[PDB]
Amino acid sequence: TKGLVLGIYSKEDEPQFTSAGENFNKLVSGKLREILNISGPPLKAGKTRTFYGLHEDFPSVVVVGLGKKTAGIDEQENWHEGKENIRAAVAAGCRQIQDLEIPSVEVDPCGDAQAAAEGAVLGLYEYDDLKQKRKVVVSAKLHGSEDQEAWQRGVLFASGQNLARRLMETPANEMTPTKFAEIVEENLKSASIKTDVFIRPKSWIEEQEMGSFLSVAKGSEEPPVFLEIHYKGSPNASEPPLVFVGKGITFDSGGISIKAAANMDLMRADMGGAATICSAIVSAAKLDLPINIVGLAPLCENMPSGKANKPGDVVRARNGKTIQVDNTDAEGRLILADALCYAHTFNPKVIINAATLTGAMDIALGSGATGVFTNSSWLWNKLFEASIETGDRVWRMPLFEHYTRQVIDCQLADVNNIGKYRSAGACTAAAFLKEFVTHPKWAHLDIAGVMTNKDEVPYLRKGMAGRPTRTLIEFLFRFSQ
Amino acid sequence: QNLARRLMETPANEMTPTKFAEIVEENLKSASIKTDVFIRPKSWIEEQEMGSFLSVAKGSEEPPVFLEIHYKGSPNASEPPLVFVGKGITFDSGGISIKAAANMDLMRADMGGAATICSAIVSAAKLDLPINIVGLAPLCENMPSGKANKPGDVVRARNGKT
Amino acid sequence: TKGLVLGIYSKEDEPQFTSAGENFNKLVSGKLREILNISGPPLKAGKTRTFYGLHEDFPSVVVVGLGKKTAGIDEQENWHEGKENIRAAVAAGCRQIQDLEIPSVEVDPCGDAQAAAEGAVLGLYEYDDLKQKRKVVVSAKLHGSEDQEAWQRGVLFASGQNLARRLMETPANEMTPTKFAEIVEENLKSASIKTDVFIRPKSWIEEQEMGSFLSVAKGSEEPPVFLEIHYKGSPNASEPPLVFVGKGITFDSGGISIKAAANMDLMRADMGGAATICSAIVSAAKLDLPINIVGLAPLCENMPSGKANKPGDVVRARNGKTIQVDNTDAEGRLILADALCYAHTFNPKVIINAATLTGAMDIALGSGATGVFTNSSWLWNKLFEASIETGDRVWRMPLFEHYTRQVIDCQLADVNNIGKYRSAGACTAAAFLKEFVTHPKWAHLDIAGVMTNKDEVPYLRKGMAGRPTRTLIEFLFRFSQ
């Protein structure tokens, strides 16, 4: 009927199976173990082998490599390695059932039903929607009935990611400042009726003295929308919130300080900051987490025109500070100078903000870890531990005065959107945003190196990554618990 | 000088083709009541067959203003003048033949020509110098857009030359 | 006769003095306190004011701002801030005595006689030697007689730095692979007779199957020298050592994969890795630290010629691994593939290596902190704590498999001197070097962002920085103790 992803570890006396496959072997009377011997060398990590006709109702059975049974937290990779073995491994497996065009598949729990589900679901995702030429659409259910809410936690966590991924990936002519707001509101509302959405327009933004956000919007003839998300998780609604903030440029052409044509099509995912955090709130509502969260996202586009933002311009942020706009591509910093100010209105506990802010971050760590600068070691630890579980690493970076200094000197104004020099790129951009924040537990996450995947993360196919949505969701689960 | 300097230095979103004209007129008028100002608009410019000036203005959605300054310094007003002229791009991005981002913020001072000479007339009025001077300055911006000036284009200057 | 740098803090009832200046006030009978009132607003951090004729033997008296008395370790700047106040502050002071052309100056201990001496000495340094037009040469002694071995520890620590600085700064036609070896040997030998030097030549290198180091040397007609330093610090000479390794390109032109002319004159300090660590061993010998240290440094130049290293070339490192040399500017990685292998010969405890390795590090942190990747959290902590004392910060970076992977795939060979992509620049370069190391406590310090100073570090004038020589020296003091 349908396919099966089964698993095996690496040697003891005979390389063992995850019990479900030990059990499926008994079932086809040793003929799985036996054909695996006949096939060739053993299956190391995330390597795959397909065995036809072993079972009457499982014509294709893919056995995938899970590595060492007792693989655990790694001091060097700063993750739980087991989970990582299982994700790459059942992603691998699920992508094999899928090339065989088997529309459904049952997955071996592999000792961690959540890693299995985060592998099967992140593993299989594409964004097929505008290609009339699509791969088969395969339904992936758990094999078994024992470990069900952890597999659904995998499906949940990986699905919150695939949403950031679709929200990122879609061409920015479809994915506008209005359409993103609309899908996020429909997604947050299906998640919890204990929610409110506000797709606030230019009049409200104008009214909110958001000059910096608004200066950025004006080049395009596409409407700005400041989005406001509310999740009423706590028992007493009056609990102070945890506010997520995120930059939402639907398309970044650089503006007058215009980008080069080389691969500029990826700028459609410069709204990755707004996508990431939104998908993460949708998931804590889906999880129905005992915390009140607020989601904030400036949405607009960065375009050249007869009325675009010019180099040398002093605009005013909500908080009275003026910014010299010396480079029109440094606009996420400006979009975020106002949504960050508005975050203090809400009286929060933690203000996590996220943004595909600078390529220098990409030069720095470049898809290994997502750089997070925070004036809070508590907050750092909190993020870093979630990174170990989820596997979507996060690395700390310096919010030293050293850097505020280069952005704080300014010919016309109070702050300047770029620093005096080329060096320390992600650090000057983060020390510019510190100027718009006075809350003690603040964290900037620069998502610009983890924007994309190719081969680096296994269980993620080539394209927009939606990183770090699960670390973020894992942080709010641990914080709620 | 410090007036040309402030008139140069101010970010070109504040220092427009209209705001420069306005500060220069207030400065020239405080200097001497023996003055006249004309912050002539696009209709006058159109009328003055200023196709070349006007082609430049069209990329931006910011208004052109041709500024005209008069200082009546001489005893006999009929003395022929000394005319100062000066380029007043409030911001230069290069247009379609667009500049590189490296330090382009300084293009706010591409109206330095109009600033320099204006500040100089304001001072000869402040000095109340026995000469009639006339100040002339095209003000506009150079921007890329759906209706910006394209490469290869023949426009016509007031004098018939293309 | 001579000048005086005195100090004052920020308000209580009347902004207090460092006791020496309270004492110098009593001495000119309140007329220092009194003229400070008459002068204007109070002196905040590292700001300066000169008072002539207060004393008969102190014609110019500079009072410098020390900030808050109780300024201490900062959780955000990750340093001892007091020390930092005092360095910038008596550097400031000493540079004022010096423009007045007063050839000598007495310095206020300022509560930490070492920070005062590290400020006066780093503060005043230039490299005047090839200018017939030089500033005055001012002798800076302590004011007082109470706290003498800590001031001499400042003078020692700052002088080990100014040596890395002179060793960096000198034009690479003077500072050759032979001349560096010669000054280091004269400096290490004046420091301790319990030392040995080996300025090993091309024949020895050839003999040591150092194909990678040697491939790099061949473009130039300037001799390679592999330098070997020995400090016999321990009681039992048989104690295993702590081996420092460091890249010593006297000049880097990129080779065939040739650099652009823009500011290429700074490549004379691509031997900053060899300078840094050498200056640090010279200082632990000067300190006579109860540890055996070994200093290792490939010295050579990177030049284009009829026999330079070409793009696409497989050369062999001492350890059997082959490297595809796809970019001739990635040569520090190659120079270090062999000196790192040779480090395991010595049976070490810690292998600290240091190198002006990549500009991407400069894009990353860029003179804030010196990036240190280490497979040793112990080693990381050890370095990071020294950074807090000295003020010369050090930031951890990721030695994740993620990065080994991009350098480990290779068309012709085993490893490749550059990675498949532009991203994660310092991380691929550090994960390439991990391939030449099998010791548990290894640490790569990429010095390329801290190569230079301008205004960022106060007590250091514009030019080669000699960073992090004091963090390094402080680590060996703490390790010996």
Ligand SMILES: [Zn+2]
């Ligand atoms: Zn941009």
Ligand SMILES: [Zn+2]
């Ligand atoms: Zn952007």
Ligand SMILES: [Zn+2]
């Ligand atoms: Zn190089």
Ligand SMILES: [Zn+2]
């Ligand atoms: Zn080099």
